[PDB]
Amino acid sequence: LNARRGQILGMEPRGNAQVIRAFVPLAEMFGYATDLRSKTQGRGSFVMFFDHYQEVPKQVQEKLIK
Amino acid sequence: MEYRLKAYYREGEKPSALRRAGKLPGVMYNRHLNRKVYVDLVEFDKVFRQASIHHVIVLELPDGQSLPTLVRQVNLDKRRRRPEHVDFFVLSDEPVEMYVPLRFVGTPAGVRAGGVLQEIHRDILVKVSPRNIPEFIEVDVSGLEIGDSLHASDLKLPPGVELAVSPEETIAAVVPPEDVEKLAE
Amino acid sequence: KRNVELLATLKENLERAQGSFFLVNYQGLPAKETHALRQALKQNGARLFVAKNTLIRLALKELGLPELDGLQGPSAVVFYEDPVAAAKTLVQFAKSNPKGIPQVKSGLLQGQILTAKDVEALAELPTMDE
Amino acid sequence: SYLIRKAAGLEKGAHKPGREKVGRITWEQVLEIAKQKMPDLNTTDLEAAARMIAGSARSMGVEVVG
Amino acid sequence: MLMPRRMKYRKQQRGRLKGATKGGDYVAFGDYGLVALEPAWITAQQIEAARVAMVRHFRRGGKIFIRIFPDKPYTKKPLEVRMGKGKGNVEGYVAVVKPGRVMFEVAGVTEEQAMEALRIAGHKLPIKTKIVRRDAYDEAQ
Amino acid sequence: MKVRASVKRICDKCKVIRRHGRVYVICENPKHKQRQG
RNA sequence: AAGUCUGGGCUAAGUGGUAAAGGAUGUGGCGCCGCGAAGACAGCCAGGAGGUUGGCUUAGAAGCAGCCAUCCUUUAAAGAG
Ligand SMILES: [Mg+2]
Ligand SMILES: [Mg+2]
Ligand SMILES: [Mg+2]
Ligand SMILES: [Mg+2]
Ligand SMILES: [Mg+2]
Ligand SMILES: [Mg+2]
Ligand SMILES: [Mg+2]
Ligand SMILES: [Mg+2]
Ligand SMILES: [Mg+2]
Ligand SMILES: [Mg+2]
Ligand SMILES: [Mg+2]
Ligand SMILES: [Mg+2]
Ligand SMILES: [Mg+2]
Ligand SMILES: [Mg+2]
Ligand SMILES: [Zn+2]
């Protein structure tokens, strides 16, 4: 998730099972549907709810325009 | 390339005895003679280790004589990997059968590809006058891809120096190279 | 014994291709400054010969067996000795005597000094181009 | 050597150079290059200068024609 | 793993590890060998462990020569059964090996690499072993 | 402490020591510590 | 019962006075290479600099995520680390 530009909010147990909560730019979240299942061997899930927009870093915002 | 090595006569002494005392029993011979000799083990080792069965060793006898020999066989102690006894063939001016090294030249195509140069022969049997031993014999191996060989039939030959074994006798080969991507089967 | 013998030679060859080679404390400075007195003396002199650094022990046997008196100034210390006659031996010894007397305190002092063929002297050497 | 992209054509590396070529440059197009951004460099020559990109081209995926 | 393709006899008497090695006491193919310092029946599974270890360390490269071969059938009575009522069943094959035998040899690889491989394969073996290199003494036999 | 029959240098900074009769390995790295046993 | 006998050596574990793979700067003795007053090994005083961010990759990997390349340069010496 850090590979996807993510600020990590924390972790917690659930069904044991550990949860992970973090802000990932939806931009870097296409493949994560089956990219999760690839790394948990068919034992993963996620939810994803928009929290906020924010200015993309100038390395991109001054480059996506091309 | 002209190695010499001090060698002393022996008669009744027990081999066990000579061996306890640093010495290495052995015998020198040829069609004309036969003497039981011994040599200091570490002196002989320093020598033979580079002389092998390849280059003339020259025996400095105590009576003063100075015989050029080839080492003809070296008996090993099977349990300890020590040399137990040496045979010294006393070279005459006739031609004599012998082993001469094969230096394998260059770097084959089968290496640089994965493979390995199996050197089926690291020297060769040869009729030759003592007055011209080639401390070498080059073989171009560079043309080999993995799968290929090279026999005595190839292999140049200095004059001269004839073979002394069927040229149907393979001397190198490039075989494939172990590899873990095999394995699981 | 050793390949410090291919160090005597190529440092006695390009030593016995002159007559007035001087000496200085040539390690003291950064790799910026140690390309500064190096760009300049590769211009303010001749060829690419500022300090052709090699061992104090080697130069002293070298400037001993190739005769040249023996620059008994002091080969001691981080000393690489600026081949002054492997450059156009001139009043360009100021290119040195100025370089370090400004850039970092004592940043290129001298020591031994052989002028023409006879030894100059200590401070008779930095006053020998100023 | 940023300049080297407009003398052979390419804009990218070769990922596996050595056997793969995707362009070429000769003994003289290296000398012109050994001149432009050269008040900088390090040395001052032309043959102590050309062998400075003649292998900075093979570090990506372009060879030297001789 | 290793075992005879066919035999004349299914089972054979145990015999006896007296003696130095009869044969195979010099290196004869590669540049480095592993030689046995103690007598044993070495099993196929052992030899095979020994091999695999070497290849996994070479990891593409080199030739491993395997100079012993397990052709002596090993018998075992079924667990929890009494004495008698016939010789037991063949459960595997072993190589009789006596001191001074070169068991494996390697070639086409560095000294700092055969050394290790051979160091390792020793570990899989149930005896003490020295690592050797070719010598003239070898060449001379 | 790792207590083992086989103690060895693990990394280039590892150090083998014998103390009060007993072979140890000490190291910059706390995981590398070993007493033989 | 009869030597706290004589001479040379080793052991520091009460080893002697019950055990294996294997591990080990234990200790004593051999042997063989390598460096060494053209000044080594250890410590410490400098230097460790360029082309250059090595291309791609990718949001960015600038000597160090990873596919690969790995030449030369002023040099006493400074790996595209
Ligand atoms: Mg020996
Ligand atoms: Mg029986
Ligand atoms: Mg039998
Ligand atoms: Mg068994
Ligand atoms: Mg049975
Ligand atoms: Mg074992
Ligand atoms: Mg041997
Ligand atoms: Mg035979
Ligand atoms: Mg372990
Ligand atoms: Mg420490
Ligand atoms: Mg007493
Ligand atoms: Mg006790
Ligand atoms: Mg006890
Ligand atoms: Mg010991
Ligand atoms: Zn460590």
XYZ file of C-alpha atoms (C1' of nucleotides) and ligand atoms in Angstrom:
721
model
C 0.000 0.000 0.000
C 3.010 2.254 0.435
C 3.830 1.150 -3.056
C 0.544 2.841 -3.945
C 1.335 6.188 -2.311
C -0.537 5.346 0.920
C -0.655 7.020 4.326
C -1.396 4.209 6.796
C -3.920 5.010 9.539
C -3.623 1.881 11.649
C -4.480 -1.747 12.275
C -6.775 -3.844 14.456
C -8.127 -7.357 14.864
C -11.434 -8.519 13.375
C -12.254 -12.210 12.920
C -8.526 -12.743 13.490
C -8.030 -11.640 10.662
C -6.317 -8.274 11.071
C -7.811 -5.094 9.566
C -5.692 -2.339 7.956
C -6.995 1.184 7.378
C -5.331 3.779 5.147
C -5.803 6.641 2.644
C -4.829 5.465 -0.827
C -5.190 7.790 -3.801
C -7.900 6.025 -5.852
C -5.601 6.745 -8.797
C -3.256 4.009 -7.572
C -6.094 1.552 -6.864
C -7.124 -0.053 -10.170
C -5.615 -3.535 -9.947
C -6.143 -3.813 -6.171
C -9.337 -5.818 -6.739
C -7.401 -9.002 -7.623
C -4.021 -7.655 -6.478
C -5.238 -8.177 -2.945
C -6.320 -11.764 -3.571
C -2.898 -12.408 -5.197
C -1.139 -11.576 -1.899
C -3.595 -13.213 0.550
C -4.260 -16.354 -1.520
C -8.015 -15.886 -1.870
C -8.365 -14.653 1.719
C -8.801 -10.897 1.394
C -11.357 -8.112 1.201
C -11.540 -4.302 1.183
C -14.152 -1.542 0.979
C -12.872 1.862 -0.262
C -14.877 5.042 0.446
C -13.931 8.485 -0.899
C -12.742 10.736 1.921
C -11.418 13.832 0.173
C -9.814 15.191 -2.990
C -6.352 16.712 -2.722
C -3.691 18.332 -4.902
C -1.592 15.679 -6.594
C 2.186 16.245 -6.245
C 3.768 18.554 -8.870
C 5.780 15.635 -10.308
C 2.406 14.393 -11.641
C 0.063 17.409 -11.799
C 2.773 19.114 -13.837
C 3.024 16.021 -16.066
C -0.423 14.347 -16.457
C -1.176 17.202 -18.859
C 0.915 15.584 -21.608
C 61.714 -28.065 -17.171
C 64.839 -30.119 -16.443
C 64.081 -31.366 -12.920
C 66.635 -33.099 -10.753
C 66.068 -34.905 -7.482
C 68.496 -36.524 -5.089
C 68.075 -40.309 -4.951
C 69.888 -42.867 -2.755
C 70.445 -46.661 -3.083
C 68.952 -49.152 -0.671
C 69.153 -52.864 -0.111
C 68.017 -54.643 3.044
C 66.175 -51.694 4.675
C 62.523 -52.287 5.394
C 60.048 -50.099 3.459
C 58.050 -49.508 6.676
C 61.380 -48.248 8.075
C 62.344 -45.947 5.218
C 58.791 -44.679 5.323
C 58.925 -43.861 9.009
C 62.006 -41.799 8.313
C 60.789 -39.391 5.689
C 61.950 -41.595 2.815
C 59.949 -42.960 -0.103
C 61.115 -46.370 -1.387
C 61.005 -46.817 -5.170
C 62.929 -48.530 -7.893
C 64.595 -47.384 -11.114
C 64.610 -49.501 -14.281
C 64.744 -50.104 -17.973
C 65.673 -52.881 -20.391
C 69.207 -52.750 -19.095
C 68.956 -52.281 -15.341
C 67.163 -52.386 -12.003
C 68.037 -50.660 -8.786
C 66.150 -50.325 -5.555
C 66.309 -46.709 -4.560
C 64.703 -44.290 -2.173
C 64.103 -40.509 -2.198
C 63.201 -38.041 0.554
C 59.447 -37.750 0.409
C 59.122 -33.978 0.513
C 61.926 -33.448 -1.959
C 60.107 -35.754 -4.395
C 56.757 -34.138 -3.736
C 58.005 -30.634 -4.496
C 59.254 -32.073 -7.787
C 56.674 -34.617 -8.936
C 53.902 -32.162 -8.265
C 54.956 -30.246 -11.350
C 56.885 -32.929 -13.124
C 54.014 -35.531 -13.000
C 54.493 -38.248 -15.631
C 55.200 -35.620 -18.149
C 58.675 -34.179 -17.819
C 62.039 -35.795 -17.285
C 63.296 -36.029 -13.734
C 67.008 -36.517 -13.375
C 68.261 -38.821 -10.709
C 71.331 -37.708 -8.806
C 72.733 -41.010 -7.512
C 75.276 -40.995 -4.651
C 77.885 -42.828 -6.737
C 77.744 -39.731 -8.923
C 75.800 -41.090 -11.917
C 73.075 -38.839 -13.308
C 70.209 -40.665 -14.954
C 67.291 -38.998 -16.738
C 64.070 -40.798 -15.925
C 60.454 -40.655 -16.497
C 58.216 -41.498 -13.571
C 56.454 -44.659 -14.771
C 54.015 -45.329 -11.899
C 53.284 -43.993 -8.451
C 51.653 -46.373 -5.991
C 49.237 -44.610 -3.591
C 48.270 -45.665 -0.050
C 44.541 -46.081 -0.726
C 43.477 -45.283 2.806
C 45.604 -42.141 3.373
C 46.251 -40.608 -0.117
C 50.020 -40.648 0.334
C 52.487 -41.929 -2.175
C 53.787 -45.283 -1.026
C 56.332 -46.169 -3.767
C 57.658 -44.795 -7.108
C 58.743 -46.352 -10.348
C 61.456 -44.522 -12.296
C 61.955 -45.563 -15.941
C 65.474 -44.953 -17.050
C 65.252 -43.145 -20.375
C 67.525 -44.387 -23.166
C 68.249 -42.649 -26.482
C 65.665 -44.851 -28.209
C 62.135 -43.484 -28.640
C 59.832 -44.308 -25.714
C 56.060 -44.343 -25.134
C 54.678 -41.587 -22.919
C 52.078 -39.112 -21.791
C 52.199 -35.491 -22.906
C 49.836 -32.804 -21.633
C 46.985 -31.339 -23.596
C 46.643 -27.547 -23.004
C 43.057 -26.697 -24.072
C 43.204 -23.336 -25.868
C 40.587 -20.615 -25.988
C 37.061 -20.645 -24.588
C 34.417 -22.786 -26.345
C 31.026 -21.634 -27.552
C 29.336 -24.122 -25.227
C 30.697 -22.352 -22.205
C 29.541 -18.672 -22.554
C 26.225 -20.440 -23.131
C 25.958 -22.308 -19.869
C 27.869 -25.482 -20.553
C 30.972 -27.255 -19.242
C 34.159 -28.453 -20.862
C 34.549 -32.070 -19.928
C 38.238 -32.821 -20.485
C 38.027 -36.619 -21.093
C 41.817 -36.585 -21.563
C 44.302 -34.185 -19.908
C 47.334 -35.691 -21.644
C 47.990 -38.215 -24.403
C 49.893 -41.382 -25.201
C 52.674 -40.806 -27.707
C 55.751 -42.418 -29.292
C 58.625 -39.978 -29.061
C 62.347 -39.675 -28.716
C 63.445 -38.341 -25.340
C 65.430 -35.676 -27.201
C 62.162 -33.848 -28.010
C 59.313 -33.744 -25.495
C 56.787 -30.966 -25.989
C 56.054 -29.552 -22.537
C 52.597 -28.682 -24.109
C 50.211 -29.722 -26.975
C 47.587 -27.241 -27.983
C 43.998 -28.019 -28.774
C 41.621 -25.460 -30.158
C 38.399 -26.134 -28.327
C 36.765 -22.823 -29.295
C 34.676 -24.364 -32.040
C 32.667 -26.500 -29.612
C 29.009 -25.961 -28.902
C 27.406 -28.051 -26.184
C 27.007 -31.522 -27.704
C 30.380 -31.684 -29.387
C 33.564 -33.624 -29.001
C 37.120 -33.832 -30.188
C 39.218 -36.963 -30.527
C 42.847 -37.803 -31.046
C 41.963 -37.846 -34.766
C 41.810 -34.059 -34.435
C 44.705 -32.601 -32.466
C 47.725 -31.353 -34.433
C 50.964 -33.128 -33.373
C 54.415 -31.455 -33.408
C 56.979 -33.351 -35.284
C 57.338 -35.973 -34.151
C 55.857 -37.509 -31.921
C 53.279 -39.952 -33.237
C 50.077 -40.912 -31.440
C 50.085 -44.164 -29.481
C 46.342 -44.602 -29.171
C 43.354 -44.970 -31.586
C 42.278 -41.592 -33.005
C 38.840 -42.991 -32.319
C 39.574 -41.937 -28.689
C 37.651 -38.874 -27.602
C 39.530 -36.253 -25.599
C 37.012 -33.524 -24.950
C 33.326 -32.826 -24.922
C 30.996 -29.984 -24.041
C 28.159 -31.210 -21.877
C 25.251 -29.194 -20.402
C 25.506 -27.792 -17.003
C 23.709 -29.270 -14.004
C 20.875 -26.592 -13.502
C 18.080 -26.458 -10.849
C 15.396 -25.728 -13.433
C 15.715 -29.431 -14.063
C 15.523 -31.134 -10.697
C 11.865 -31.359 -9.664
C 11.295 -34.741 -11.426
C 59.291 -6.844 -4.565
C 57.076 -5.206 -5.402
C 54.991 -3.560 -8.115
C 56.442 -0.715 -6.100
C 59.315 -1.366 -8.518
C 57.197 -0.189 -11.447
C 56.855 2.820 -9.139
C 60.596 3.565 -8.788
C 61.098 3.452 -12.559
C 58.180 5.509 -13.936
C 58.971 7.964 -11.108
C 62.723 8.042 -11.826
C 62.110 8.217 -15.577
C 59.922 11.358 -15.355
C 62.273 12.584 -12.592
C 65.443 12.089 -14.626
C 63.659 14.077 -17.333
C 64.378 17.376 -15.582
C 66.666 18.926 -12.985
C 64.643 21.281 -10.778
C 61.837 19.296 -9.103
C 60.430 20.834 -5.862
C 58.333 19.509 -2.899
C 55.082 20.327 -1.012
C 52.479 19.029 1.535
C 50.027 17.775 -1.136
C 47.239 15.877 0.616
C 45.738 18.424 2.999
C 42.774 19.473 0.791
C 39.283 18.284 -0.428
C 38.798 16.807 -3.921
C 37.576 20.222 -5.086
C 40.742 22.027 -4.034
C 42.740 18.893 -4.942
C 41.733 19.503 -8.548
C 42.290 23.253 -8.155
C 46.063 23.455 -7.620
C 45.852 20.548 -10.128
C 44.052 22.263 -12.983
C 46.333 25.326 -12.539
C 49.790 23.698 -12.284
C 48.705 21.527 -15.245
C 48.538 24.933 -16.981
C 50.819 27.221 -14.912
C 53.838 25.074 -15.782
C 54.333 22.371 -18.430
C 52.569 19.100 -19.320
C 50.128 17.537 -16.850
C 52.622 17.620 -13.949
C 51.715 19.377 -10.726
C 52.375 16.835 -7.988
C 53.042 13.364 -9.394
C 52.456 11.862 -5.899
C 54.554 8.843 -4.949
C 56.173 7.536 -1.762
C 58.587 9.633 0.342
C 60.569 6.389 0.599
C 60.595 5.945 -3.183
C 61.543 9.552 -4.155
C 64.458 9.516 -1.623
C 65.895 6.252 -3.077
C 64.927 7.603 -6.496
C 66.597 11.025 -5.942
C 69.477 9.038 -4.440
C 70.313 6.333 -7.010
C 69.631 8.734 -9.922
C 72.141 10.855 -8.041
C 70.293 14.222 -7.801
C 71.981 15.114 -4.440
C 69.057 13.837 -2.362
C 66.498 16.557 -1.617
C 67.293 16.382 2.169
C 64.699 19.091 2.919
C 62.229 16.574 4.589
C 60.437 13.802 2.652
C 58.544 13.198 5.901
C 54.784 14.021 5.983
C 51.889 13.767 3.496
C 54.350 14.847 0.777
C 53.737 14.406 -2.971
C 56.358 16.906 -4.207
C 55.285 19.123 -7.088
C 57.650 18.165 -9.934
C 58.616 21.785 -10.629
C 60.824 20.902 -13.598
C 58.289 18.405 -14.906
C 56.595 21.747 -15.400
C 58.094 24.841 -17.063
C 60.176 25.681 -13.980
C 59.621 29.408 -13.656
C 58.205 32.080 -11.357
C 55.086 29.901 -11.680
C 56.061 28.471 -8.259
C 53.839 31.348 -7.216
C 50.936 29.358 -8.693
C 51.610 27.222 -5.626
C 53.000 29.738 -3.104
C 49.700 31.703 -3.482
C 47.234 28.824 -3.927
C 47.234 27.637 -0.320
C 48.340 30.739 1.605
C 44.696 31.940 1.008
C 42.589 28.791 0.432
C 42.296 27.125 3.880
C 45.075 28.052 6.343
C 48.453 26.711 5.094
C 46.619 24.924 2.255
C 49.727 24.126 0.142
C 53.042 24.710 2.023
C 56.501 23.812 0.593
C 59.534 22.059 2.088
C 62.301 20.578 -0.019
C 63.500 22.689 -2.981
C 66.051 21.876 -5.706
C 66.637 24.811 -8.044
C 68.335 24.121 -11.396
C 70.481 21.374 -9.836
C 71.485 22.726 -6.433
C 68.999 22.819 -3.555
C 67.193 26.100 -3.055
C 65.878 26.263 0.532
C 62.794 26.375 2.779
C 61.292 29.867 2.596
C 63.831 30.618 -0.156
C 61.394 28.640 -2.357
C 58.027 30.439 -1.853
C 59.998 33.667 -2.130
C 61.340 32.141 -5.353
C 58.394 33.272 -7.515
C 57.017 36.097 -5.361
C 24.836 13.102 -22.130
C 21.159 13.995 -22.074
C 21.907 15.149 -25.621
C 22.369 11.571 -26.878
C 18.610 11.008 -27.493
C 18.550 13.103 -30.693
C 21.613 11.680 -32.444
C 20.515 8.048 -32.634
C 16.781 8.710 -32.435
C 15.708 6.677 -29.371
C 14.237 8.071 -26.135
C 14.490 4.983 -23.915
C 16.930 2.373 -22.583
C 17.140 -1.182 -23.874
C 16.461 -3.069 -20.643
C 18.807 -5.839 -21.828
C 21.671 -4.332 -23.903
C 24.774 -6.282 -24.934
C 23.144 -8.372 -27.658
C 20.163 -6.106 -28.290
C 20.760 -2.959 -30.319
C 18.087 -0.330 -30.979
C 20.230 2.297 -32.690
C 23.848 3.243 -33.442
C 26.506 5.998 -33.321
C 29.981 6.085 -34.949
C 33.529 7.255 -34.075
C 32.757 10.902 -34.876
C 29.253 11.549 -33.588
C 30.924 10.886 -30.246
C 33.376 13.754 -30.735
C 30.708 16.367 -31.418
C 29.016 15.160 -28.234
C 32.446 15.330 -26.615
C 32.251 19.103 -27.109
C 28.870 20.663 -26.252
C 28.478 20.290 -22.475
C 32.302 20.325 -22.235
C 33.271 23.594 -20.532
C 32.226 21.418 -17.585
C 33.422 17.781 -17.915
C 36.707 17.101 -16.095
C 39.484 16.587 -18.645
C 40.282 18.964 -21.545
C 40.991 16.713 -24.583
C 38.857 15.114 -27.306
C 39.931 11.428 -27.026
C 39.940 11.720 -23.247
C 36.470 13.205 -23.771
C 34.817 10.912 -26.350
C 35.418 7.719 -24.370
C 33.191 9.382 -21.732
C 29.906 8.842 -23.583
C 31.108 6.023 -25.874
C 30.318 3.783 -22.891
C 27.571 5.974 -21.448
C 25.705 4.878 -24.561
C 26.354 1.174 -23.992
C 25.227 1.545 -20.355
C 21.666 1.777 -21.676
C 21.403 0.086 -25.064
C 23.367 1.672 -27.934
C 26.722 0.576 -29.427
C 29.724 2.193 -31.172
C 30.294 1.660 -34.931
C 33.924 1.173 -36.012
C 16.611 -42.334 -7.095
C 19.323 -44.870 -7.737
C 18.807 -48.644 -7.861
C 19.569 -51.494 -10.249
C 17.247 -51.837 -13.222
C 17.323 -55.602 -12.797
C 19.118 -58.131 -10.580
C 19.687 -61.868 -10.629
C 18.944 -62.076 -6.925
C 16.390 -60.035 -4.979
C 18.282 -60.058 -1.635
C 21.862 -60.456 -0.546
C 23.864 -61.353 2.545
C 25.165 -58.525 4.623
C 28.862 -58.943 4.136
C 31.408 -56.882 5.940
C 33.116 -53.494 5.849
C 36.685 -54.722 6.296
C 39.465 -52.958 4.369
C 40.543 -49.865 2.500
C 38.652 -49.109 -0.717
C 39.327 -51.666 -3.391
C 39.182 -49.208 -6.209
C 38.188 -45.628 -6.912
C 40.760 -43.965 -4.730
C 41.889 -41.263 -7.218
C 40.019 -38.431 -8.882
C 39.261 -39.353 -12.396
C 36.848 -36.867 -13.987
C 36.532 -33.532 -12.276
C 38.747 -31.107 -10.425
C 37.593 -31.776 -6.867
C 36.314 -34.864 -5.117
C 34.684 -35.791 -1.806
C 36.427 -38.758 -0.224
C 35.130 -41.043 2.513
C 37.054 -41.339 5.779
C 34.972 -44.143 7.331
C 33.267 -47.360 6.118
C 29.439 -47.379 5.529
C 26.468 -48.545 3.591
C 25.479 -45.270 2.013
C 21.849 -45.270 0.905
C 20.336 -44.098 -2.334
C 18.339 -41.479 -0.548
C 21.570 -40.245 0.946
C 23.499 -40.032 -2.375
C 20.448 -38.229 -3.812
C 20.358 -35.710 -1.011
C 24.060 -35.308 -1.580
C 23.548 -34.569 -5.256
C 20.641 -32.239 -4.981
C 22.503 -30.224 -2.417
C 25.299 -29.731 -4.904
C 23.155 -28.671 -7.736
C 21.151 -26.310 -5.604
C 24.439 -24.602 -4.768
C 25.761 -24.512 -8.316
C 22.272 -23.301 -9.450
C 22.880 -23.856 -13.173
C 26.574 -24.546 -13.892
C 29.133 -27.311 -13.381
C 29.108 -31.098 -13.672
C 28.504 -33.426 -10.707
C 29.978 -36.909 -11.186
C 28.559 -39.601 -9.041
C 31.107 -42.299 -8.527
C 29.317 -44.729 -6.133
C 26.055 -46.479 -6.921
C 23.737 -48.296 -4.553
C 23.324 -51.841 -5.833
C 23.185 -53.752 -2.517
C 19.546 -54.336 -1.567
C 18.683 -53.522 2.029
C 16.283 -55.860 3.844
C 13.929 -55.199 6.760
C 11.489 -57.324 8.790
C 8.038 -55.752 9.136
C 7.607 -53.770 12.403
C 6.465 -55.579 15.511
C 7.238 -59.117 14.082
C 9.214 -61.971 15.685
C 12.409 -63.636 14.628
C 12.414 -66.218 11.891
C 9.909 -67.150 9.213
C 12.272 -66.009 6.442
C 14.518 -63.118 5.377
C 12.829 -59.699 5.437
C 11.819 -57.401 2.651
C 13.856 -55.135 0.494
C 13.215 -51.581 1.682
C 15.893 -49.809 -0.381
C 19.425 -49.953 -1.783
C 22.777 -49.031 -0.410
C 26.311 -48.428 -1.582
C 29.044 -50.101 0.420
C 31.782 -47.526 0.724
C 35.140 -47.886 2.495
C 37.804 -45.344 3.517
C 39.604 -43.595 0.630
C 36.809 -43.827 -1.947
C 35.994 -40.761 -3.969
C 32.270 -40.586 -3.886
C 31.464 -37.490 -5.836
C 33.590 -35.243 -8.053
C 32.907 -31.792 -9.451
C 34.136 -29.769 -12.443
C 33.550 -26.596 -14.326
C 33.260 -24.250 -11.385
C 35.440 -22.206 -8.979
C 37.466 -23.554 -6.107
C 35.605 -21.312 -3.712
C 32.487 -23.002 -5.110
C 33.310 -26.686 -5.262
C 34.613 -26.351 -1.753
C 31.272 -25.221 -0.491
C 29.160 -27.644 -2.495
C 31.312 -30.515 -1.352
C 31.344 -29.106 2.201
C 27.611 -29.276 2.090
C 27.125 -32.645 0.507
C 29.361 -34.118 3.216
C 26.761 -33.017 5.723
C 24.072 -35.126 4.133
C 26.383 -38.163 4.442
C 26.518 -40.397 7.440
C 30.363 -40.439 7.640
C 33.389 -38.127 7.854
C 34.753 -36.920 4.494
C 37.697 -34.887 3.154
C 37.641 -32.644 0.134
C 40.459 -33.231 -2.349
C 41.711 -31.653 -5.580
C 43.470 -33.157 -8.606
C 47.137 -33.816 -8.231
C 49.681 -35.398 -10.413
C 49.327 -38.474 -8.246
C 45.783 -38.646 -9.458
C 46.820 -38.000 -13.039
C 49.452 -40.724 -12.791
C 47.041 -43.686 -12.024
C 21.149 -15.393 23.298
C 21.088 -18.283 20.836
C 22.233 -21.436 22.634
C 23.518 -24.104 20.257
C 25.920 -26.906 19.557
C 27.035 -25.101 16.436
C 28.102 -21.511 17.006
C 29.588 -19.538 14.173
C 30.330 -16.050 12.937
C 27.110 -14.924 11.273
C 28.132 -11.600 9.706
C 31.530 -9.957 9.002
C 31.216 -8.013 12.256
C 30.700 -11.090 14.388
C 33.254 -12.045 17.119
C 34.123 -15.459 18.678
C 35.137 -15.340 22.327
C 35.726 -17.987 24.942
C 34.698 -17.002 28.399
C 34.837 -18.798 31.708
C 35.103 -22.071 29.863
C 32.439 -21.437 27.318
C 32.577 -20.436 23.732
C 30.443 -17.345 22.888
C 29.766 -15.201 19.919
C 29.380 -11.477 20.448
C 28.304 -8.895 17.883
C 27.181 -5.373 17.081
C 23.993 -7.235 16.189
C 21.963 -8.534 19.212
C 20.514 -11.381 17.165
C 23.978 -12.744 16.565
C 24.791 -13.416 20.184
C 25.453 -17.130 20.817
C 26.507 -19.245 23.749
C 27.444 -22.776 22.926
C 25.134 -25.387 24.592
C 52.477 -55.712 50.497
C 56.325 -52.870 47.595
C 59.186 -46.080 44.518
C 55.655 -40.052 47.544
C 62.081 -43.935 42.368
C 65.065 -41.583 37.997
C 65.085 -38.840 33.140
C 62.415 -36.216 28.780
C 57.373 -34.451 27.138
C 52.230 -33.080 27.483
C 47.527 -31.908 30.058
C 44.634 -27.234 33.739
C 39.650 -30.295 32.168
C 39.642 -33.351 38.601
C 40.365 -34.130 31.613
C 42.113 -38.636 33.975
C 37.330 -41.004 36.584
C 31.891 -43.909 30.300
C 29.129 -41.074 24.223
C 28.268 -38.952 18.296
C 27.619 -35.748 14.137
C 29.292 -31.085 14.573
C 31.106 -26.381 16.650
C 35.407 -23.378 18.552
C 41.349 -17.408 18.502
C 41.827 -23.787 24.277
C 47.075 -25.453 24.348
C 51.715 -27.301 22.634
C 54.291 -28.882 18.408
C 55.238 -29.464 13.103
C 54.323 -27.788 7.647
C 53.020 -24.849 3.584
C 51.803 -20.336 0.963
C 51.038 -14.259 1.172
C 52.604 -9.460 2.829
C 57.243 -7.011 5.227
C 62.792 -1.422 6.860
C 61.426 0.063 -1.414
C 58.185 0.451 6.200
C 53.689 -4.698 6.269
C 49.463 -6.212 10.121
C 46.575 -3.098 14.081
C 44.992 1.872 15.451
C 44.585 6.955 14.185
C 45.579 11.653 10.149
C 44.127 13.161 4.612
C 41.431 11.714 0.129
C 37.135 8.683 -1.310
C 36.377 13.221 -6.639
C 33.975 13.217 -12.157
C 30.690 12.296 -17.275
C 26.250 11.370 -13.713
C 20.094 11.501 -12.039
C 24.189 5.390 -15.688
C 19.518 4.433 -19.232
C 14.768 2.405 -18.519
C 11.164 1.645 -14.842
C 7.754 4.761 -12.306
C 4.695 9.502 -8.783
C 9.897 9.463 -7.853
C 14.542 5.174 -7.343
C 19.807 10.840 -7.832
C 26.164 5.009 -6.119
C 21.885 1.400 -2.848
C 12.975 -1.232 -5.011
C 13.819 -4.236 -9.427
C 14.594 -5.734 -14.707
C 19.860 -4.924 -17.324
C 24.422 -2.285 -18.673
C 29.055 -1.972 -15.803
C 32.706 1.710 -20.251
C 36.283 5.568 -19.579
C 38.160 9.971 -16.715
C 41.779 14.283 -13.804
C 44.400 10.481 -10.782
C 48.778 8.812 -5.312
C 43.684 6.177 -5.223
C 37.992 7.029 -5.073
C 32.807 0.369 -7.793
C 28.176 3.827 -12.716
C 29.076 1.594 -5.597
Mg 52.382 -35.140 0.676
Mg 24.814 -61.539 8.223
Mg 32.806 -58.371 -1.222
Mg 21.106 -48.196 7.142
Mg 15.426 -59.519 6.574
Mg 28.524 -36.141 7.943
Mg 46.633 -37.329 -4.232
Mg 43.405 -49.072 -12.669
Mg 23.471 -23.357 12.697
Mg 31.825 -6.133 19.579
Mg 58.757 -38.593 42.164
Mg 37.643 -36.760 37.859
Mg 34.492 -37.266 35.735
Mg 44.678 -28.324 17.841
Zn 27.239 -10.386 13.434
